[PDB]
Amino acid sequence: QDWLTFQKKHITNTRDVDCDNIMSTNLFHCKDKNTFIYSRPEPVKAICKGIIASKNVLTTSEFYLSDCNVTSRPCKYKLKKSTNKFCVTCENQAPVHFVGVGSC
């Protein structure tokens, strides 16, 4: 919804996200999946530089992604690490929503 929230939901300090821990918190409330971007925030913010009105943009560069995917056991996950481009909703120069991996 805003940069601060996007940060809280999608930027990670570690590639090895503890899915079973984080996913069970109120922010995620055992949802099926969540994509975390392993990067300093600036390279992420830069994706949206100069974009004012809401617009989906696919990153030009590739980023380290860590996805928490639910298994057959509710609220129990598998961490999958990958490298890919991603689509974000940019608004007033910052990412406000995560769209998807690989394409808009």
Curated annotation (Swiss-Prot):
EC assignment: 3.1.27.-
Full protein name: Protein P-30
BP GO terms, sorted: defense response to Gram-positive bacterium
PROSITE patterns associated with the record: RNASE_PANCREATIC
InterPro entries in the cross-refs: RNaseA, RNaseA-like_dom_sf, RNaseA_AS, RNaseA_domain
Domain of life assignment: Eukaryota
Binding site for substrate: K31, D32, K33, N34, T35
Main enzyme class: hydrolase
Gene3D superfamilies, per database record: Ribonuclease A-like domain (3.10.130.10)
Disulfide cross-links: C19-C68, C30-C75, C48-C90, C87-C104
Lineage of producing organism: Eukaryota, Metazoa, Chordata, Craniata, Vertebrata
Entry keyword set: Disulfide bond, Endonuclease, Hydrolase, Nuclease, Pyrrolidone carboxylic acid
A GO molecular-function annotation: endonuclease activity
Active site per database record: H10 (proton acceptor), H97 (proton donor)
Family indicated by similarity: Belongs to the pancreatic ribonuclease family.
Function summary: Basic protein with antiproliferative/cytotoxic activity against several tumor cell lines in vitro, as well as antitumor in vivo. It exhibits a ribonuclease-like activity against high molecular weight ribosomal RNA.
Signal sequence segment: none
